Each structure stands twice: as structure tokens, then as C-alpha cells.
Nucleic acid binder design. Structure first.
Ligand SMILES: [Mg+2]
Ligand SMILES: [Mg+2]
Ligand SMILES: [Mg+2]
Ligand SMILES: [Mg+2]
Ligand SMILES: [Mg+2]
Ligand SMILES: [Mg+2]
Ligand SMILES: [Mg+2]
Ligand SMILES: [Mg+2]
Ligand SMILES: [Mg+2]
Ligand SMILES: [Mg+2]
Ligand SMILES: [Mg+2]
Ligand SMILES: [Mg+2]
Ligand SMILES: [Mg+2]
Ligand SMILES: [Mg+2]
Ligand SMILES: [Mg+2]
Ligand SMILES: [Mg+2]
Ligand SMILES: [Mg+2]
Ligand SMILES: [Mg+2]
Ligand SMILES: [Mg+2]
Ligand SMILES: [Mg+2]
Ligand SMILES: [Mg+2]
Ligand SMILES: [Mg+2]
Ligand SMILES: [Mg+2]
Ligand SMILES: [Mg+2]
Ligand SMILES: [Mg+2]
Ligand SMILES: [Mg+2]
Ligand SMILES: [Mg+2]
Ligand SMILES: [Mg+2]
Ligand SMILES: [Mg+2]
Ligand SMILES: [Mg+2]
Ligand SMILES: [Mg+2]
Ligand SMILES: [Mg+2]
Ligand SMILES: [Mg+2]
Ligand SMILES: [Mg+2]
Ligand SMILES: [Mg+2]
Ligand SMILES: [Mg+2]
Ligand SMILES: [Mg+2]
Lengths: 129, 14
RNA sequence: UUAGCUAGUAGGUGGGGUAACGGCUCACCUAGGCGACGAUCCCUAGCUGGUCUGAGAGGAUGACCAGCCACACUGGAACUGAGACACGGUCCAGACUCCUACGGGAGGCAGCAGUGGGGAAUAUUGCACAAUGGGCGCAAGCCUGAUGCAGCCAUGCCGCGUGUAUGAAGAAGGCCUUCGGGUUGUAAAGUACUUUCAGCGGGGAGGAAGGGAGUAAAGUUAAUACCUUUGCUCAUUGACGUUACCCGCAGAAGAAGCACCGGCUAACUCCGUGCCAGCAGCCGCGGUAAUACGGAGGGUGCAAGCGUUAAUCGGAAUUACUGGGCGUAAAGCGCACGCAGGCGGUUUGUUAAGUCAGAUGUGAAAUCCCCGGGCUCAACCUGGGAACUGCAUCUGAUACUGGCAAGCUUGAGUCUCGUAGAGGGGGGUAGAAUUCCAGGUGUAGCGGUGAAAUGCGUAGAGAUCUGGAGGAAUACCGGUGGCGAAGGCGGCCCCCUGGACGAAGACUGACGCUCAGGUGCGAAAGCGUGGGGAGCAAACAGGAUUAGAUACCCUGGUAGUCCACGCCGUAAACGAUGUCGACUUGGAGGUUGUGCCCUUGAGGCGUGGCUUCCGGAGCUAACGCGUUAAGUCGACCGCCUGGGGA
RNA sequence: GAGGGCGCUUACCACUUUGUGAUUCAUGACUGGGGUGAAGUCGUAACAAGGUAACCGUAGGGGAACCUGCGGUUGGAUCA
């Protein structure tokens, strides 16, 4: 059903980005905040707010160029049907280093560019292309 | 198509 | 198209047993063991370090080298010995051959070659202990078909030569030719230069260290003997070997072929032949003009090799993890329930299981890769490093996944009030129509077709009216209308009973999704037993049609259609779309509710459930789909791999 | 005397014999289809509304292509 909520999060981002929507809403969680705040610090989105404490509702502000999609495509890599893990030197790049790869480690959620100074590996979340 | 289907039986090489 | 296997089997006591633990063996005791994470059975196969292919992931295989296990004519057994159940040890049996005076014995080439035979196909019945390794011995020495070598086999890889400089009316010849000219063609000849290798003569490193005889020092010892070790000196140790190498000689003298030439794929003309012959990997060439056949001319690609056949991978993303599809190209089980299995909302703590970080140990050498060195070069040999992405352990980090603990409510459920519906089963009941039967009035055709006939009827058909019997179906309502998981489901009424949906809240707290085997439902035909019988109607009867009519058409007609009781489980069982959830512009409507509103009309405004037709973005092979997806995604399952065989 | 050897006997057991099974190859009268066949015979089924719309499933029929019965579908023309 909603068994991969991160893949449900990537579905709601990719649709409203392409369909010229100004802002989207989604059910919040701890892990969804730990991904959207990284995308806010990497220039892909604008802002996020939390609403509700018994039903946590996350909101995302979209971002455009001249009415053109900033996030052109995003790819869920690991999934509950097949888990993907890499080491500190087998971290894949997106568009040969242009896009970022969201990898959550013990030192929080960071990119593979940020995992060079950290020297860790773990679960690949999404290819932000 | 499903990876979990190939756990039971792999792709049958002719 | 293998689902149950197993009684010394699984475990325990005690005795015995080997070098060691142990059903390894024996009595007793228990009834367990193994197994849908493949037990067991059948077939096949030595495995690994690797080689080859491939960008990689993968793929196919295990020759030479190295590691291990098994085996030594077949089968079984023990001795010996530290080590064997023993390749050239023994014993017994069987098989085969040999010797024999007939009673008997002898033998194991899968050791080196070599013969016979098999097969497309794989070698001399060679030399040596010079070196290395091993065996014995104090050493000398001996032995070694290990190994070092040699020969054969273009069998593979790599290197070199078969000349070079110069030489145009550019000769001849061949072929093409619009006979003007081009081609072969600086190519040949001739003019100059030179000798890689082979041939012929000479010299000649290294593979060799030792070992053996004198001798000094040191050592112990009663000892300057003997011996041990370190020195020095003398004479020696090469199968390959006519060694590599090098000097010298003579002269281009001794040293180039095969395949192709339509496209793929490098190169174009001519003649001969006539869908014949032939060619061919594919496409398909050739019956009167064939660059594709045969030959010639000329060229191309290779090269001491060149082609062909067979085999492996690549190309092939053509078993798609990387990296494929399933509406119609092959493919979504007919549908539903559900175990095992996979997967799982949200908050916090804990464990550190998975994962990640660091470190140790290990991953034999050789092969591959990096930089070197060496053989005149290369192949080849080789130094160190990297690689071997592996496995085990310790110390760490806690975001995610897993486990535990406490939760939370939007997921999924529970109650109440309600509304709609051909949902199913059972029991009654109604009225037309069909046919049969009874009666009445009534007369010559009824019936049927394109046209006729079979058939029915003067016993009065048909038609009409009255009355009764039986059987099955439900006009109109009724409509891309409703309901059900689906096939499907339709007069009305009662009874029993199922799900779906909406409103207001209350409440449990992930209770969920999905499904291989298993389980049930599942159109009609048909099958079993016993009823039932109008109408329709396989086979069949009969008449037209016709070449024949078996079919069509018509008049009849059994099985069946109906019910009970089972079985059968297949359909174009189709939305030709498996289920569930999350999102993404919209209209025309339908159906079913609910909330509010000058109720100011069955209306206005919203808002859920179900459903059809259009259509944007997007997707798609096209058709079309397009908030009910075939758009973008997740969870899980089924299924397909050229057509035919099937 | 102790002890050993020989001999005999017993346990285990290869080969070997009968009875009777399971499995595999070769041979195999006969027999079941199917494929490959441009011109052979027999017919005209299907593709158009292919001249009785076609097709799927099922029962029956007959040299055969096929036909009829029941039910389903549009992968059917014409349509109102
Ligand atoms: Mg014991
Ligand atoms: Mg050898
Ligand atoms: Mg070996
Ligand atoms: Mg042995
Ligand atoms: Mg033996
Ligand atoms: Mg021998
Ligand atoms: Mg031999
Ligand atoms: Mg032979
Ligand atoms: Mg000439
Ligand atoms: Mg020479
Ligand atoms: Mg010497
Ligand atoms: Mg060409
Ligand atoms: Mg030829
Ligand atoms: Mg000709
Ligand atoms: Mg060569
Ligand atoms: Mg082949
Ligand atoms: Mg492939
Ligand atoms: Mg494909
Ligand atoms: Mg198809
Ligand atoms: Mg279906
Ligand atoms: Mg190694
Ligand atoms: Mg090394
Ligand atoms: Mg090396
Ligand atoms: Mg060199
Ligand atoms: Mg009636
Ligand atoms: Mg509560
Ligand atoms: Mg019957
Ligand atoms: Mg008839
Ligand atoms: Mg019956
Ligand atoms: Mg079927
Ligand atoms: Mg359709
Ligand atoms: Mg459009
Ligand atoms: Mg549409
Ligand atoms: Mg096939
Ligand atoms: Mg026909
Ligand atoms: Mg027809
Ligand atoms: Mg029909």
C-alpha cells in the first residue's frame, strides 16, 4: 500500500513539478524531514513547514526556472523489495557527479560529496537527477 | 520482472 | 513427468574398538531422525587456483603448469611397516592370453616409447646422469624413461630473409578500346650497390657449482695421529654440441603463395554457357547483354602461410540483477478465500542482528595488471608492488532495515441511525401465449416457400367461442440502468440470509497488503439414478433444391432442454487489461446519497459511492488509453522466449 | 607346566544358484499419428455481408474440407 513512504514522497514531488503546481502537501514523518531539509540545502526546493501534531502534514514549496522543472527526474534506488547498500568507495554518482545521491549514514543524511569528508557508507535513498 | 520471483526460480536459459 | 525417505536408521546407558572423538561395533532403552531453505530417487560430471569470451555484471569450460581427492585388468580381504588397505607387494575368485611331458603354473603398458584396434585426428621402439630434485651410504660412488635434452608433427605464438639504389616513348606480349589511347608498368631488362640466413672454412662464452689429491690455521684429544671446519695449490668434471655468438669467402646468386572480386565487405570489364550445368553463409544469381556460372585480363585482402569445416562466448538488452515484456505482436491462471513465504503507517527507548567505519589474521605459487631487468629483438623468462572485490575476529558509530518494550491514530476494523438493488436459497400464487382434449356455430381448403411439395382436413380441418388439463418462460416497465468475486442474475408475494454505500460520533490500536501447494464457486453441452414433457430441437423420417443434398428451405420428430440427487470443471469464462495503495488539468451525463439555503417549485449551493462517452499534458509500435490509466511509482503473485510440431 | 603352531569348528563376507520383482538399452511382426512435397485426383471451406456472418467450448453426423444442436464473444458487414 503506502509501504514505501519515501517512494510515495518522490511521486508527489515529481508530479507537481511537471504539472506546474505551486506547492504540494504530504503526510510528514521523521525521515521525510531528514530528506527535504537536505534538498533545501542543495538548491532543489525552497522551503518546508510542518502542520499538525496528531496528523503530521508536511508541505513543500516548488521551484521553477522559467516555468521549467528544476528537478527534471528523480529515481528511487533502494526499496523494501530489494535493499541496496554500498561502501565508502563504491558510492555512485548521478550524471557523472552533477546530480547528488542521497545516502543516509550514522552521521545523518548527507550526499556522496559530503560522505567523502565523512568516509562512511550505507543506504542509498534516491538519485536526485 | 520481480526480483522476489527469481528467488524461487531463476531465468531458464535455453 | 521423483514427495515422503529411513530400524544400526536418530538419541542414551554400558562393553568393545582405532593413533585420536564418534553407531566405528555389540546387547539394552527411547521413537525419534531427515524433508518443499529440495530429503530421497534417476541421469551427468573429478574439483579448485585458472584459461577463453565480454565495457562491466555475467557467460562457457577445467588440456599443458601447480594444489587436492579418487583409481592402478574386475571384485573382496588382510599382513608388513612410522606412514598403504599397496601402480611395477601378497592372498582368494572371475575374465582373457601364454608355457606345458596334461597334472599344472605365468601375466597385468591408465610408467617411457612402440604395435594392433577405434576414430576426422596427435610423435622416435632416441641420448645422458652434465645440471636440478629424490632414494641408499660416513663419504666416495651407484640408481632415477623424474627431469635435463634431441628428433618427428608450419600444431600454435613471435622474429627475419627471399634484395636495394637507379632506370620511360612508357620495349615486347596479354587484355580493354569510341583503334585516337590507356593498362600491365620503374614493374622487367640493363646500369650500380650489398650479403640477414642457408652453403662453405676458422675461432669460440656460458649452462659447473662441486667432487678428488697434497697442504697451513683453528678445534678437541695423553697427543705434533685420525677426523671436523676454514684457507691455499695442482690435475680434472658437458648429454645437448658440428652450441649460441663471431671472423672470412662467393655472387642476387639458395629462398612467395593462397583466397576474393553483386551487396553485406576491399576490388570491373570481357567471353563462353542458357533456370540446363553449376554457384551459395545470408539476400537470392543464370531460359539469349550473367562484373554473382566457367575461363581470361586486371585488382584487392593477407602472408610462409592462406582458406574451409566443427566447437565456445560475443554480437543477442534473444531468459533482460545490471538491462525486456504480458489491451490486440507469444504471454495476466475463469474467479474468490487463505497457511507457509515476501512486505509493511507513525513516535520514543533499547539491542547492535543486517549494513557501514577502522584494525588484525588469512585469501599457496604460477596466470592477469603496474614499473623494471634479461635473452641481439619479440615471443618468452623474471624482480618487487598492486590485484585476488573473499572469509573469520575485535573495537566503533545508530540515520535506515530487523528484534524487544511502551505508544499514537490517518491505514485496516467495530457499533448505531438509515437508503438503494434482477444477490442467493426455499415455498406459494397470477395472467397472456403455445399445444393437447371436450362442446358449440360454421365450410373447402388449411398449412408452408423465391416458387412448390411432403404434411393436415368433409370422421368437418383451419377460423371463432365456451370450458378444462399440462408444461416452460416472464411482454410493457427497461435504459452504455442496477446488483454480485466471476460465470451470471428479471412476473408478483412471504420467509430465511449475504455483501455494498452514506451521515453523525464513540471505540480497538497496524489488528495490514499479497499469495506457490491446499480449498470452494464456476456458461452451456455431455455423463449416472429416478421423475417430467408443451414448445423448440443433434441423430433420424419425409418432401423440394441439386451434379449429388449428406447442409441450406419446409413438414414432423427422439436424446436433451425441466426438477431432485451427484459427477464432469472446460469457453472468444473478454474490459482479449491479476490484486491493493499513493498522487497528477479538466467537461458532457447517468445512477445513488447527504449537508446548508429569500422551503420562496420536483429548485440554488456544496459534497462522498458507482458508471459511460469526449479530451489536455504525459505514455504508446500504431490503434488508442488518458483521475475507473494502457501517466508517473511502490508491495506481491502468475505467465511468455521464432512459426509449425503441440 | 606356562605359552605357541598346526588342524577342526563358528561369526562376518566376495563370487556363485533358484524363486520372483523394479529399472535401462538393443532388436522387434504389427500399429498410432505428424511433418516435408510447384505442378496428381477429389471438392470450394475460410479471407468481401467470400455468396447459410465468422470464431471459441461442447455433443452428434459423414470420403474429406466441414455441417447441425446448445451457449458465449465481436477478433462481423449493413445499421437507427
Ligand atoms: Mg558409547
Ligand atoms: Mg607432465
Ligand atoms: Mg593434477
Ligand atoms: Mg588407496
Ligand atoms: Mg588393491
Ligand atoms: Mg605396471
Ligand atoms: Mg604413455
Ligand atoms: Mg578403425
Ligand atoms: Mg599489346
Ligand atoms: Mg647467415
Ligand atoms: Mg668452464
Ligand atoms: Mg565496394
Ligand atoms: Mg568461384
Ligand atoms: Mg549471355
Ligand atoms: Mg610468421
Ligand atoms: Mg555453428
Ligand atoms: Mg545476453
Ligand atoms: Mg522484446
Ligand atoms: Mg497474441
Ligand atoms: Mg479476469
Ligand atoms: Mg597467488
Ligand atoms: Mg609473486
Ligand atoms: Mg608475473
Ligand atoms: Mg627490449
Ligand atoms: Mg395458455
Ligand atoms: Mg486508546
Ligand atoms: Mg448418457
Ligand atoms: Mg432441418
Ligand atoms: Mg439427463
Ligand atoms: Mg483455456
Ligand atoms: Mg474492446
Ligand atoms: Mg491532445
Ligand atoms: Mg479518452
Ligand atoms: Mg517452442
Ligand atoms: Mg466457401
Ligand atoms: Mg462463410
Ligand atoms: Mg452464436
Amino acid at each position: 500500500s503506502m509501504q514505501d513512504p519515501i517512494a510515495d514522497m518522490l511521486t508527489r514531488i515529481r508530479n507537481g513539478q511537471a504539472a506546474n503546481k505551486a506547492a504540494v502537501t504530504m503526510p510528514s514523518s521523521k525521515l521525510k524531514v531528514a530528506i527535504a531539509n537536505v534538498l533545501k540545502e542543495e538548491g532543489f526546493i525552497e522551503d518546508f513547514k510542518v502542520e499538525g501534531d496528531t496528523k503530521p502534514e508536511l508541505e513543500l514549496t516548488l521551484k521553477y526556472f522559467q516555468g521549467k522543472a528544476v528537478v527534471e527526474s528523480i529515481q528511487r534506488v533502494s526499496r523494501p523489495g530489494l535493499r541496496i547498500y554500498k561502501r565508502k568507495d563504491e558510492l555512485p554518482k548521478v550524471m557523472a557527479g552533477l546530480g547528488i545521491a542521497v545516502v543516509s549514514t550514522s552521521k545523518g543524511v548527507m550526499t556522496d560529496r559530503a560522505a567523502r569528508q565523512a568516509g562512511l557508507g550505507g543506504e542509498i535513498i534516491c538519485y536526485v537527477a | 520482472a520481480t526480483v522476489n520471483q527469481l528467488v524461487r526460480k531463476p531465468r531458464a536459459r535455453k
